Motif scaffolding. Structure first.
Motif, mmCIF file in Angstrom:
data_model
loop_
_atom_site.group_PDB
_atom_site.id
_atom_site.type_symbol
_atom_site.label_atom_id
_atom_site.label_comp_id
_atom_site.label_asym_id
_atom_site.label_seq_id
_atom_site.Cartn_x
_atom_site.Cartn_y
_atom_site.Cartn_z
ATOM 1 N N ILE A 15 -15.426 21.543 -32.108
ATOM 2 C CA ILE A 15 -15.254 20.311 -32.007
ATOM 3 C C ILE A 15 -13.803 19.724 -32.869
ATOM 4 O O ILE A 15 -13.069 18.911 -32.632
ATOM 5 C CB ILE A 15 -16.341 19.439 -32.714
ATOM 6 N N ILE A 49 -27.332 18.819 -31.696
ATOM 7 C CA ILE A 49 -26.231 18.174 -32.435
ATOM 8 C C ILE A 49 -26.167 18.261 -33.787
ATOM 9 O O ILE A 49 -27.278 18.022 -34.585
ATOM 10 C CB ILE A 49 -26.226 16.624 -31.738
ATOM 11 N N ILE A 50 -25.142 18.206 -34.254
ATOM 12 C CA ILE A 50 -24.564 18.620 -35.724
ATOM 13 C C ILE A 50 -25.138 17.678 -36.688
ATOM 14 O O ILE A 50 -25.369 18.257 -38.213
ATOM 15 C CB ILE A 50 -23.167 18.917 -35.822
ATOM 16 N N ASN A 51 -25.268 16.378 -36.585
ATOM 17 C CA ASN A 51 -25.294 15.277 -37.372
ATOM 18 C C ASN A 51 -26.982 15.416 -37.504
ATOM 19 O O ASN A 51 -27.267 14.280 -38.522
ATOM 20 C CB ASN A 51 -24.966 13.816 -36.838
ATOM 21 N N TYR A 98 -23.471 10.852 -42.339
ATOM 22 C CA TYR A 98 -22.350 11.520 -41.319
ATOM 23 C C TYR A 98 -22.474 13.005 -41.482
ATOM 24 O O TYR A 98 -23.195 13.443 -42.112
ATOM 25 C CB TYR A 98 -21.019 10.872 -41.594
ATOM 26 N N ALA A 99 -21.786 13.554 -40.313
ATOM 27 C CA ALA A 99 -21.590 15.196 -40.576
ATOM 28 C C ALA A 99 -20.027 15.343 -40.515
ATOM 29 O O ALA A 99 -19.436 14.678 -39.577
ATOM 30 C CB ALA A 99 -22.709 15.472 -39.372
ATOM 31 N N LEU A 100 -19.590 16.299 -40.922
ATOM 32 C CA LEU A 100 -18.370 17.005 -40.789
ATOM 33 C C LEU A 100 -18.484 18.303 -40.060
ATOM 34 O O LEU A 100 -19.583 18.992 -40.043
ATOM 35 C CB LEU A 100 -17.770 17.376 -42.120
ATOM 36 N N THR A 101 -17.518 18.563 -39.247
ATOM 37 C CA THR A 101 -17.366 20.102 -38.508
ATOM 38 C C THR A 101 -15.788 20.281 -38.560
ATOM 39 O O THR A 101 -15.083 19.745 -37.880
ATOM 40 C CB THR A 101 -18.068 19.665 -36.931
ATOM 41 N N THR A 102 -15.505 21.166 -39.415
ATOM 42 C CA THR A 102 -14.129 21.575 -39.599
ATOM 43 C C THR A 102 -14.190 23.262 -39.828
ATOM 44 O O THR A 102 -13.432 23.715 -40.780
ATOM 45 C CB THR A 102 -13.370 20.986 -40.867
ATOM 46 N N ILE A 161 -20.369 16.078 -29.149
ATOM 47 C CA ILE A 161 -21.001 17.477 -28.794
ATOM 48 C C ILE A 161 -20.042 18.473 -28.371
ATOM 49 O O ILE A 161 -20.372 19.530 -28.165
ATOM 50 C CB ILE A 161 -22.251 17.542 -27.623
ATOM 51 N N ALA A 175 -12.794 16.791 -38.613
ATOM 52 C CA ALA A 175 -13.441 16.196 -37.615
ATOM 53 C C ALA A 175 -15.003 15.628 -38.066
ATOM 54 O O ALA A 175 -15.588 16.272 -38.894
ATOM 55 C CB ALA A 175 -13.651 17.159 -36.511
ATOM 56 N N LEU A 176 -15.134 14.579 -37.635
ATOM 57 C CA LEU A 176 -16.563 14.011 -37.940
ATOM 58 C C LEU A 176 -17.390 14.236 -36.502
ATOM 59 O O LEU A 176 -16.778 14.438 -35.426
ATOM 60 C CB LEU A 176 -16.779 12.305 -37.774
ATOM 61 N N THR A 177 -18.710 14.343 -36.652
ATOM 62 C CA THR A 177 -19.597 14.443 -35.535
ATOM 63 C C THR A 177 -20.860 13.876 -35.810
ATOM 64 O O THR A 177 -21.607 14.264 -36.669
ATOM 65 C CB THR A 177 -19.960 16.043 -35.013
ATOM 66 N N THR A 178 -20.761 12.498 -35.415
ATOM 67 C CA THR A 178 -21.937 11.638 -35.855
ATOM 68 C C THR A 178 -22.451 10.888 -34.264
ATOM 69 O O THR A 178 -22.713 9.965 -34.416
ATOM 70 C CB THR A 178 -21.527 10.474 -36.821
ATOM 71 N N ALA A 179 -22.711 11.793 -33.519
ATOM 72 C CA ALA A 179 -23.132 11.554 -32.192
ATOM 73 C C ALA A 179 -22.414 10.356 -31.774
ATOM 74 O O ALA A 179 -21.406 10.359 -31.551
ATOM 75 C CB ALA A 179 -24.648 11.301 -32.325
#
Ligand code: N32
Ligand code: N32
Lengths: 412, 412
Positions: B139, A138-140, A157-161, B108, B158-162
Motif C-alpha cells: 500500500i 484489512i490492516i486497520n 487509524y492504521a499505518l502501512t509503511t 486494501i 500511507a494510511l489504511t483505514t478502509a
C-alpha cells in the motif's frame, strides 16, 4: 504547547516468546527463534525457515468464533494490544474514552487470509469466499477490533509503511498525544507473512537468506557471509500516555518518547543509498525533534536486516550523524535473534530499546563472527553488554525509501 | 504556532473521468459511471457491474516497463498524484524537497496483483511469483514511487483505514503541515478492488447492490429501495500547502482546509450505530477544530454508500449535530454517480467538496426517487443545486468503526 509522552504498557508476540518478559529473556540470553517452517510444504521454495510465534493460543484473548473471523496478523496485534493495556493498568471510562485511540499497523497485512480465500475461489468458485474475508483481512482491523472491544473513541487509524510500519505507528501516535489530540494511544504493528506469497514474494525479490542448512545462523547483520533477511511473524504494542495523565493515576513509567523522525530517501524502491543518506536525515530530524545533541545517544537498535546493502548503509548513516561518538555508543540488531517481523519489526524493537533503558544493557547481535569491511563500531557481537544507557534510538527503513527513527530517554 | 493549510493542486481518476475537470462535469451533469464489468467473466457472481476507470492510459505518465510491474491501484495513485503536482505549479528543488512529503493511502491495495500471483502459485508454483510482487502490490508504494519519481524527502507514509483512508490521509497530512513537520504534502488515496476476491468478498459480506438489471440505478443513497453499495475504482490526490508558502510563490488557492475530525465508533466491525454517534462525534470534533458555528456549514458531501444501515445512520448524525440547521444546509452523495471508490472515496469526495466551494454548487444525489423515512433534509435529489457555500464538510466512515471529517472554507 507540546506535551511529554511516556510508555506505561508493552505487549509482544515474537519468535522468542508469547509475551514481553519471555521475548526479553531470549534477547539477553542471545537465543534464536528461527527454525524450519512446520505449517506448510516449502519443497519448491528457496527459503524453508523463519521466525514463527510458537504455541500461540488466541482463546486467551478471543472467543473461537471471534478468532475465526480474523487473519493471524490481526489475532497477533490484538494479543500484543491486550497485553499492553493490561500492562498499563489503564481504566477506560465514560470520562476518558474519547481521549484514548489506537494506531496498530502492518506492512503486508492479510496476505495469508487472501491466499486461503484465493484457494477456495480457484478450487470451488466465489460462493466459497468467507463472509468475513474483507473485515477479517484489512490492516486497520487491529485498530478497529481493539477500539470496539475496549470502547476507545479517540483517533482510530492504521499505518502501512512496509518495514517502517511499527516505528511510524508509534511516532505518529506520540504526535497525537504531544499535540493534545489524545491523552492515551495504543501503537505498534503486527505481521504474519509466513505464507506461499510472503516467502515466495520476498524470495522472488532475492531478499531472503537461503541458508536452509543452519536457520539459527542465517540472520547475521554486518557479518561478511550475510545473504539476506529472515522472515518472521509477531506483534508489538506500546501504551503511550501524556506524562501528567500517567503520574495522576500512579502509572509505572518505562521511558519517555522524546524524538520522532520520518524522511523519505527518494532513492530506489527496494535498495537503500550505500552512503546511508536516508537513515542519516531521519536520525538527525529525530534528534532535532528531541532537542538532543548526537553525543547524548548511548544505544542504537539498528534496522540491521542482514542484507548486504542495508547493513553497510546503516553503518555509513551512523558514522555521518555521530562522527567520533559512533565509537562510544553501542549499536546492535535484535533481528540476529528474532529475524525480520517486517511491519512489526519497529514495534518489537521499540520495546527492546525501552527495556535496554530499564535494564542498562545493550542486547547482542548474535552470529557476528566476521564483521565486514567498515563495520568497526561496537556492534555488541555474541553477548549482552551491561552499560549506561540514558538515550536509546530505534531505526527502521522500508521499501519505497521510507525511514523512521524513535528516540527514548530514561527518566527519574 | 499551528499554521494554516490550503489546497493548491488536485488530481483524479474516476468512473466519470481521467482528470478533475472531466469528472466534475460528470458530477454536475448527474452522470453515472456504473456499467457491466468488461475485464472478467462474473457469471458465477451475484454482482456483475461497477465503476471502472474507462480508457485509462498509464503511458500518459509512466513507461510500459515500469507500469507493467505496478498494480492498478499504484498506477491510479501515481496518475492522480502527478496531476495534482502539475496542477499546483510547484517546483521541487534542493531548497524545499526535504519539506515536501507524501501520504497516499489505500483500503486494501494490490488485490488484483495478489490474486494473479496466487493463480501463478497454485497452478505453476513459487518460481513463477513476480520479483516485483511485493514492491508492486503493497500500500505504501504510491507514497514510495511518487517520492522516488519527484525526489520528495519529507515525511513519507500511507494510511489504511478502509473506506475512511482518503479522508484520514488528507487530514493527517494537513496536521503534518500545521505542526511544522512539512510545508507541502501530496495526500489522498487510490483503490482497484474490482477482481474476483473484491466482488466475491464484498458480495459474501452481503454489502453490494445486486441490481444487475439496472447498473446506473443501483447506487441510490437514502432511497427506500437501496440494497448495498456499488464497487468503483480510482484515485484522488490534493497538494496541501502551508498558507505563507502558497502566498509567497503566488499559488492559485482552491480552498482552506480548516478542520479535521477522527473518532472510533467502538460499536461493530462492519455496521454503524443506528443513531450515527461516531459520525456525530467526528463532525463535532472537526467543526470545533475549525472554530466554526455549525450554522456556517452550507454543504455536506455525505459518505452516503447506498447501504440500508449506513444512509440512515448519517441522517441521524447530521440531525444530532446541526439541529434545525440540518434543514438549511445541502447534503448529497456523489456515490450516487461514482459508486464507492473505498480508500479513494474520501480523496475524490474532498476534491468534489473543494469544487463545490470554487463553483458555488451542490452536486446532486441521483436515483433518489423515493426518500426513505426520516430522510427529510435537502439531499439535492436528481440535479445539481447552485447555492451559496462558504463551508463544505466531507464525511467518511469505515469498517472497524473508523470515522473522519474534513472541513473546507472559501479562502479570503
Ligand atoms: C535492487 C536489488 C539489489 C539487491 C542486492 C543487495 C541487497 O542487499 C538486496 C537483496 C536488498 C536491499 C535492501 O537492503 N533493501 C531494503 C530496503 O531498502 C529497505 C528495507 C529493507 C528491509 O528488509 O526492511 C530492505 O531489505 C537488493 C534488493 C534487490 C535485489 C538484490
Ligand atoms: C453486520 C452487517 C449487517 C448488514 C445489514 C445491513 C447493511 O446496511 C449492511 C449491508 C451494511 C452496514 C454498513 O453500512 N457498513 C459500513 C460501515 O460500517 C462503514 C463503512 C461502509 C462503507 O461501505 O464505506 C459500510 O458499508 C450490514 C453489513 C453486515 C451484513 C448486513
Amino acid at each position: 504547547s507540546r506535551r511529554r509522552v511516556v510508555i506505561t504498557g508493552m505487549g509482544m508476540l515474537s519468535p522468542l516468546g508469547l509475551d514481553v518478559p519471555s521475548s526479553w529473556e531470549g534477547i539477553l540470553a542471545g537465543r534464536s527463534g528461527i527454525a524450519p517452517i512446520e505449517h506448510m510444504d516449502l519443497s519448491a521454495y528457496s527459503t524453508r525457515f523463519g521466525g514463527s510465534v510458537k504455541g500461540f493460543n488466541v482463546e486467551e484473548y478471543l472467543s473461537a468464533k471471534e478468532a475465526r473471523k480474523l487473519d493471524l496478523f490481526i489475532q497477533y496485534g490484538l494479543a500484543a494490544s491486550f497485553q499492553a493495556v493490561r500492562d498499563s493498568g489503564l481504566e477506560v471510562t465514560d470520562a476518558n474514552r474519547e481521549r484514548i485511540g489506537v494506531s496498530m499497523g502492518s506492512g503486508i497485512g492479510g496476505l495469508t487470509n487472501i491466499e486461503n480465500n484465493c484457494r477456495s475461489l480457484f478450487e470451488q468458485g466465489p460462493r466459497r469466499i468467507s463472509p468475513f474475508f474483507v473485515p477479517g483481512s484489512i490492516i486497520n482491523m487491529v485498530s478497529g477490533f481493539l477500539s470496539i472491544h475496549l470502547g476507545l473513541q479517540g483517533p482510530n487509524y492504521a499505518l502501512t509503511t512496509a518495514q517502517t510500519t511499527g516505528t511510524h505507528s508509534i511516532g505518529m501516535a506520540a504526535r497525537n498525544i504531544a499535540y493534545g489530540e489524545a491523552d492515551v494511544m495504543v501503537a505498534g504493528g503486527s505481521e504474519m507473512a509466513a505464507c506461499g506469497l510472503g516467502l515466495g514474494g520476498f524470495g522472488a525479490a532475492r531478499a531472503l537468506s537461503t541458508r536452509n542448512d543452519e536457520p539459527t545462523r542465517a540472520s547475521r547483520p554486518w557479518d561478511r557471509d550475510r545473504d539476506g533477511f529472515v522472515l518472521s511473524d509477531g506483534s508489538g504494542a506500546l501504551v503511550l500516555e501524556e506524562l501528567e495523565h500517567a503520574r495522576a493515576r500512579g502509572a509505572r513509567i518505562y521511558a519517555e518518547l522524546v524524538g520522532f523522525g520520518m524522511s523519505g530517501d527518494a532513492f530506489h524502491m527496494t535498495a537503500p543509498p550505500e552512503d546511508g543518506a536516508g537513515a542519516a536525515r531521519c536520525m538527525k530530524n529525530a534528534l532535532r525533534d528531541a532537542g538532543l545533541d548526537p553525543r547524548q545517544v548511548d544505544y542504537i537498535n539498528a534496522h540491521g536486516t542482514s542484507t548486504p546493502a542495508g547493513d553497510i548503509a546503516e553503518i555509513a548513516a551512523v558514522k555521518s550523524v555521530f562522527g567520533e561518538h559512533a565509537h562510544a555508543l553501542s549499536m546492535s540488531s535484535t533481528k540476529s535473534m528474532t529475524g525480520h517481523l517486517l511491519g512489526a519489526a519497529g514495534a518489537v524493537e521499540a520495546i527492546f530499546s525501552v527495556l535496554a533503558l530499564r535494564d542498562q544493557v545493550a542486547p547482542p547481535t548474535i552470529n557476528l563472527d566476521n564483521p565486514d569491511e567498515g563495520c568497526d563500531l561496537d556492534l555488541v557481537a555474541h553477548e549482552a553488554k551491561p552499560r549506561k544507557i540514558d538515550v536509546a534510538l530505534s531505526n527502521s527503513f522500508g521499501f519505497g525509501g521510507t525511514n523512521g527513527t524513535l528516540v527514548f530517554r530514561r527518566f527519574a
